[PDB]
Design a protein around this ligand. Structure first.
Ligand SMILES: CCCCCCCCCCCCCCCCCC(=O)OC[C@H](COP(=O)([O-])OC[C@H](O)COP(=O)([O-])OC[C@H](COC(=O)CCCCCCCCCCCCCCCCC)OC(=O)CCCCCCCCCCCCCCCCC)OC(=O)CCCCCCCCCCCCCCCCC
Ligand SMILES: CCCCCCCCCCCCCCCCCC(=O)OC[C@H](COP(=O)([O-])OCC[N+](C)(C)C)OC(=O)CCCCCCCCCCCCCCCCC
Ligand SMILES: CCCCCCCCCCCCCCCCCC(=O)OC[C@H](COP(=O)([O-])OCC[N+](C)(C)C)OC(=O)CCCCCCCCCCCCCCCCC
Ligand SMILES: CCCCCCCCCCCCCCCCCC(=O)OC[C@H](COP(=O)(O)OCCN)OC(=O)CCCCCCCCCCCCCCCCC
Lengths: 171, 87, 459, 128, 40, 177, 100
């Protein structure tokens, strides 16, 4: 399974079958045949495999990286600190990439699960997607193929100079 | 599809076309009857005969090969050599 | 990386202490073992390169080039053992030794942590390649091929030596790991302009650049088959590897200095592909196709976006496998008709049907058929160059027309039509030849299942 | 009377419409006889090799080897730099390079000026 | 079909007194084999 | 201007080839057989109008303007027979016309699948290699000086000789393998 | 007769003296064992075990980890009202700007 809060789904509301005609639809018979012929043998095989998993239980872990000093508190041309800052920045870069991927999955799943009323009923996912793409674009865009924490800090300083100049000229 | 041709079948169909032609009398026709010398025809008539052979057997005889076929036996031997009969 | 250099070195006693009949079998077996061992370089991380020592490291750029390099050697030994069957035993061992020494120079060209050791191995790869082309080539023009191959390269690279020693004296180190953290912005000046040209023109020669490509259709058609496979598969990619290392130092001048070298590529891949529409020689057609495909890698490195680097390294690995297979197929016809003329032997699907299936698959991977890594690299370069300028799609898309129009033309001229009547020495395909085609194509197809290992340091 | 057939570069004149075909002169018949003799001699020289049981290989065609050597190995030794080849080599060699240089330079100056003024829609562009 | 190796026409290019014969370097015969000249 | 045996087309051959092209393009023009037969008799009457024209200059002029008449009155899609060049079935089976020397490259396991065929093939190959030197010395004693004039091959003039250069005419592939 | 010379030999066929040839060597035992070496260490060892090795790479360049860590961090900052990503990569408090 997964976590229902990071991958949200609204509650499924299926309608009850209200057959009007007297003709028996083939789909109920095919659902019964799929449950009797397919779902039960696959379920038995999976329960056997699950018992064989339960006979020897072992674990893997999620690797925790502690927060080393970033590039702003590294001395210039001091490789033993700015190496660690650069590795921290590259890991956070991959994590921010996957956050953008998660929100894209949310947007596409909303569009499919809402179907035809998706333009009204997916305004929240579109707003979250616009926010996270604007943040990712202000954070990591236009750095180049030799991207680094120095390049990203220089882009941030240029953008903050633009923000401070726009604050000064409009006051 | 496409039943195989025999020499007797090609000869019968060639003589069958040439007996249906209103310048060749069928009582004089043979397989060795030369069209210009033994039947008294024209070169235009020989071109029409080779065109009737082409319409009969469904394939074109080129003109450099057509202008050398001057008896029914040469026509039968040409169609034999092209259709590869008596395998 | 010393667990790969020492087995490659120990292939020298393995080829010189063997029996007179076992020297192909032993070198093939143990080079296949080295190629199996080459997969331990896939211990790559999303932040840090695999840094072995002060001398050798391997990121996700060098690792596919290393696996392709150590895989190409048994394939070159399989291709080269037919036309060297009447050869003297000593000269046979000398040829195998030049291939072994060339592999040894390549696998520590790609892992050289420091850039002047990269230069020394990068320019040490000339001498076994020169000896292979000019000694075991077939025609008269192998000597001129060696001269053009040597003197475009050294003319490009002798400024590169001076530029690297300038970086050594200015920065303090040519360690690529230090130069990731001590890189300074290279400003706009004439000194920095010729700095950029000295850093780039060596690799522009070895890619090749259009206009500087003239060494290649001589060096590919006059080499033997192991030489053609190593120039197509690996020795063009030294330029791409060196560009992707050296463009770290060449910023931000590249953003206005790469303009003449993109145009030369973007029009040049139109020209050389067009040349492949009219090449009478089959091996020359494969050579000009190699120029046409490496022009996209030149564009992708010079625009230096991440998608461009990912497409360029995928395109390098894919083109290495594909062009090596194409030269092996052209050799398979040359070993029967003894002429490289493409219009000589025709209709060869009636005579060699399974070899025509290998021709079909190699021609489909030449024309970038999805989901091959040829199309993955081609496509990502086209995406990043559409990001560069939206008009470039014209020069991209037209190229993707012409790349089809010689990939299938080569298929239709060699393999289709009515066969040549007066050629009757067309033997059935040997198990060596079909094995060679399968060892080129089956890794190229299995890499479509998992392309993330051939997408460079920034996947 | 009739619309006269105008032959073109890619639509040639037919054999049956050529006025030079209907000349039965002996000086143009000796040329046809000599061409037929050359063709018959080359045909005999070919098929005395093509029908040989001892031969197993490629019948070498000197016309094909001669064609490939003319197309490849004999282009530079027959070159003279003059006004024609220089005004063709510059108009075709550096011409399109200068053209695509100014096209891509104007396009990227326009796009760069739109981006650094914020006047280009670059909202969801985070892949580059 | 076999490997090209140089013939007399190729090898006699390297036999002159110089390598690139011009108008001045045309009367130069190659030197004697034991480098010993007739006493004249 | 282009024939294998002669160096030229005669005037009579040009008139006959125009007559056959005119009838085939007429049949392409007019589709039905009765209506074709009507206009074909009319075209035959037009050819028989000027049949006995002894002036060769006037006859060449009539041939030339009749070619102009044909070229104005031809068909854009003439009827082509399927295996005739330009037809739909033309050179269709050339991908199945495997030459006979490939049977020499078979494995002995797949030669043993047809014992009598290869045992009968070997006497054809013996016949060919025991007739080759006789037919070569037949050609070189009959060809005049300066090589052969025409492309016509002579027949076998003796009893026991095969005709010269016969192998790739006799052992050619079938049309429908 | 210029430059006395061996005549150029005929093209030799490996199938004539060995109809079971694999194309590796004129000696049939060496030929069959070179075939077995090429097929065993080429396909049974490099391709099969190499595809099995690349299929089970231990999280090649941390791309699974980077997803799973992201599935933590979004889950941390959805619940605490924080935005999913800041426009600033670094803290703006710890940056000295050049004055103007
Ligand atoms: C990790 C485990 C992986 C397992 C799965 C394998 C994954 C892919 C591996 C490679 C697969 C292809 C290999 C076969 C082709 C080459 C040999 C050949 O000639 O075959 C004919 C021959 C059969 O012919 P025959 O009648 O006996 O005689 C031959 C004829 O005389 C003459 O032959 P012909 O004319 O009859 O045949 C020509 C015909 C020509 O047909 C075509 O060219 C048409 C097909 C291609 C174009 C259209 C499809 C495009 C792609 C769409 C499909 C893929 C995506 C689908 C997924 C959903 C959508 C995304 O070829 C085919 O039909 C070949 C089918 C496979 C084609 C694959 C694409 C190649 C095209 C070029 C690149 C395209 C992009 C890359 C695709 C990558 C896919 C992973 O095949 C064999 O004998 C097969 C031998 C065993 C092959 C083993 C392959 C795997 C080896 C890997 C070893 C290590 C890992 C262990 C796994 C082992 C698995 C068993
Ligand atoms: C493949 C064929 C074409 C090859 C082209 C190769 C590249 C083209 C440019 C090469 C220039 C030479 C190497 C430059 C190295 C730069 C190092 C550096 O930092 O320089 C800064 C230095 C500047 O001096 P400085 O940096 O020491 O000064 C101190 C700093 N300031 C400036 C503040 C005082 O540049 C130079 O001194 C000169 C650079 C230009 C060199 C001109 C001579 C060579 C001309 C081109 C030759 C090209 C190859 C010819 C062969 C062709 C085939 C036969
Ligand atoms: C690498 C650079 C140098 C290049 C040359 C290399 C030469 C040396 C060769 C070494 C060995 C080979 C290396 C590459 C190995 C690539 C394979 C690999 O690892 O794959 C990993 C991938 C891994 O997939 P994955 O990454 O999604 O799996 C998750 C990972 N695990 C397994 C840990 C949970 O393998 C597969 O995808 C296998 C899937 C099943 C097998 C194939 C199924 C499809 C077959 C066809 C089905 C029908 C389709 C339509 C067909 C129609 C007709 C055509
Ligand atoms: C085809 C053969 C194979 C390929 C060979 C290589 C081809 C590509 C390399 C050459 C292409 C042309 C030169 C490069 C053009 C782009 C960069 C450049 O130099 O721009 C021209 C420059 C523009 O002026 P500006 O921008 O002020 O430059 C001052 C720099 N501090 O203009 C000027 O400053 C005026 C001109 C100065 C002299 C230029 C020529 C000598 C230097 C370059 C060599």
């Amino acid at each position: 399974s997964w976590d229902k809060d990071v991958y949200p789904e609204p509650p499924r509301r299926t309608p009850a079958p209200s057959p009007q005609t007297s003709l028996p639809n083939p789909i109920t018979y095919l659902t019964k045949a799929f449950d009797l012929l397919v779902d039960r043998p696959v379920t038995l095989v999976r329960e056997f495999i699950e018992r064989q998993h339960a006979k020897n239980k072992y674990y893997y872990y999620h690797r925790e990286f502690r927060r080393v000093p970033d590039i702003t508190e590294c001395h210039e041309k001091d490789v033993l600190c700015m190496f660690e800052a650069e590795m921290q920045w590259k890991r956070d870069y991959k994590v921010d990439q996957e956050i953008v991927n998660i929100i894209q999955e949310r947007l596409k799943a909303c569009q499919q699960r809402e179907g035809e009323s998706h333009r009204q009923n997916c305004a929240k996912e579109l707003q979250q997607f616009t926010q996270v793409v604007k943040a990712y674009q202000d954070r990591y865009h236009d750095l180049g193929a030799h991207y680094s924490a120095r390049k990203c800090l220089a882009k941030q300083k240029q953008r903050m100079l633009a923000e401070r100049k726009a604050t000064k000229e409009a006051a | 599809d496409a039943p195989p041709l025999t020499l007797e079948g090609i000869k019968d169909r060639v003589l069958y076309v040439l007996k249906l032609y209103d310048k060749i009398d069928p009582e004089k026709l043979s397989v060795n009857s030369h069209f210009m010398k033994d039947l008294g025809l024209d070169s235009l008539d020989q071109v029409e005969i080779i065109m009737a052979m082409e319409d009969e057997f469904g394939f074109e005889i080129p003109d450099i090969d057509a202008e050398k076929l001057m008896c029914p036996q040469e026509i039968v031997d040409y169609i034999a050599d092209k259709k590869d009969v008596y395998e | 990386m010393l667990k790969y250099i020492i087995p490659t070195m120990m292939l020298m006693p393995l080829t010189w202490l063997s029996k007179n009949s076992m020297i192909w079998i032993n070198t093939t077996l143990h080079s296949l073992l080295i190629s199996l061992t080459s997969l331990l370089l896939l211990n790559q991380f999303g932040d840090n390169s695999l840094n072995f020592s002060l001398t050798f490291f391997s990121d996700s750029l060098s690792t596919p080039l290393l696996i392709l390099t150590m895989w190409l050697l048994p394939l070159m030994l399989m291709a080269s053992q037919h036309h060297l069957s009447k050869e003297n035993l000593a000269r046979k061992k000398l040829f195998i030794s030049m291939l072994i020494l060339l592999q040894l120079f390549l696998i520590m060209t790609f892992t050289a942590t420091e850039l002047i050791f990269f230069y020394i191995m990068f320019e040490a790869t000339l001498v076994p390649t020169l000896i292979i082309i000019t000694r075991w080539g077939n025609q008269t023009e192998r000597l001129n091929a060696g001269l053009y191959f040597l003197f475009y390269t050294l003319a490009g690279s002798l400024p590169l030596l001076v530029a690297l020693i300038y970086i050594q004296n200015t920065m303090g180190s040519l360690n690529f790991l230090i130069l990731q953290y001590w890189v300074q912005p290279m400003p706009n000046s004439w000194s920095n302009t010729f700095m950029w040209l000295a850093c780039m023109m060596a690799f522009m020669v070895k890619m090749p650049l259009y206009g500087l490509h003239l060494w290649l259709p001589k060096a590919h058609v006059e080499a033997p088959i192991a030489g053609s496979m190593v120039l197509a598969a690996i020795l063009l990619k030294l330029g791409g590897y060196g560009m992707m290392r050296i463009t770290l130092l060449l910023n931000p001048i590249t953003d206005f200095m790469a303009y003449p070298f993109i145009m030369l590529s973007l029009w040049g891949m139109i020209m050389t592909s067009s040349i492949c529409l009219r090449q009478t020689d089959l091996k020359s057609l494969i050579a000009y196709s190699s120029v046409s495909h490496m022009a996209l890698v030149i564009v992708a490195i010079l625009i230096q976006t991440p998608w461009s680097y990912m497409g360029a390294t995928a395109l390098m690995i894919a083109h290495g496998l594909t062009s090596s297979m194409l030269f092996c197929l052209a050799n398979s016809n040359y070993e029967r008709v003894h002429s490289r003329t493409m219009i000589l032997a025709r209709g060869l699907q009636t005579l060699l049907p399974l070899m025509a299936a290998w021709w079909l698959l190699a021609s489909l991977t030449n024309l970038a058929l999805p989901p091959s890594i040829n199309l993955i690299g081609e496509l990502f370069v086209v995406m990043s160059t559409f990001s560069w300028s939206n008009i470039t799609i014209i020069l991209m898309g037209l190229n993707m027309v012409i790349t089809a129009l010689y990939s299938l033309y080569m298929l239709i001229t060699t393999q289709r039509g009515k066969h040549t009547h007066h050629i009757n020495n067309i033997l059935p395909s040997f198990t060596r030849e079909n094995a060679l085609m399968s060892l080129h194509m089956l890794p190229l197809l299995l890499l479509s299942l998992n392309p993330k290992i051939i997408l460079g340091p920034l996947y | 009377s009739f619309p006269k057939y105008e032959p073109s570069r890619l639509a040639s004149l037919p054999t049956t419409l050529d006025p030079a075909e209907y000349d039965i002169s002996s000086e143009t018949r000796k040329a046809q006889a000599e061409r037929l003799a050359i063709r018959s001699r080359l045909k005999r020289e070919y098929q005395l090799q093509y029908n040989d049981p001892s031969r197993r290989g490629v019948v070498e065609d000197p016309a094909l080897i001669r064609w490939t050597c003319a197309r490849s190995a004999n282009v530079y030794p027959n070159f003279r730099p003059n006004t024609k080849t220089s005004l063709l080599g510059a108009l075709f060699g550096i011409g399109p390079l200068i053209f695509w240089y100014y096209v891509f330079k104007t396009d990227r100056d326009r796009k760069e000026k739109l981006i650094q003024e914020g006047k280009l829609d670059r909202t969801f562009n985070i892949s580059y | 079909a076999r490997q090209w190796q140089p013939d007399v026409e190729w090898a006699e290019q390297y036999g002159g007194a110089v390598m690139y014969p011009t108008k001045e370097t045309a009367h130069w015969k190659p030197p004697p084999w034991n480098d010993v000249d007739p006493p004249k | 201007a282009f024939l294998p045996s002669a160096a030229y087309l005669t005037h009579q051959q040009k008139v006959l080839q125009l007559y056959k092209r005119a009838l085939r393009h007429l049949e392409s023009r007019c589709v039905h057989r009765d209506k074709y037969r009507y206009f074909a008799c009319l075209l035959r009457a037009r050819f028989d109008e000027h049949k006995n024209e002894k002036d060769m200059v006037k006859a060449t002029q009539l041939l030339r303007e009749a070619e102009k008449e044909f070229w104005h009155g031809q068909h854009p899609q003439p009827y082509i027979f399927p295996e005739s060049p330009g037809g739909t079935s033309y050179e269709r089976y050339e991908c199945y016309k495997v030459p006979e020397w490939c049977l020499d490259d078979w494995h002995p396991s797949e030669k043993a699948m047809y014992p009598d065929y290869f045992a009968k093939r070997e006497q054809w190959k013996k016949l060919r290699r025991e007739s080759w030197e006789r037919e070569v010395k037949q050609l070189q004693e009959e060809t005049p000086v300066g090589g052969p004039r025409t492309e016509a091959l002579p027949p076998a003039r003796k009893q026991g000789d095969l005709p010269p250069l016969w192998w790739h005419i006799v052992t050619r592939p079938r049309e429908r393998p | 007769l210029r430059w006395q010379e061996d005549p150029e030999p005929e093209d030799e066929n490996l199938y004539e003296k060995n109809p079971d040839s694999h194309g590796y060597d004129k000696d049939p035992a060496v030929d069959v064992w070179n075939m077995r070496v090429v097929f065993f260490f080429g396909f049974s060892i490099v391709l099969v075990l190499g595809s099995t090795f690349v299929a089970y790479l231990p999280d090649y360049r941390m791309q699974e980890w980077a997803r799973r860590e992201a599935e933590r961090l979004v889950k941390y900052r959805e619940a605490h009202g924080l935005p999913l990503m800041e426009s600033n990569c670094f803290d703006p408090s710890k940056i000295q700007l050049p004055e103007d």
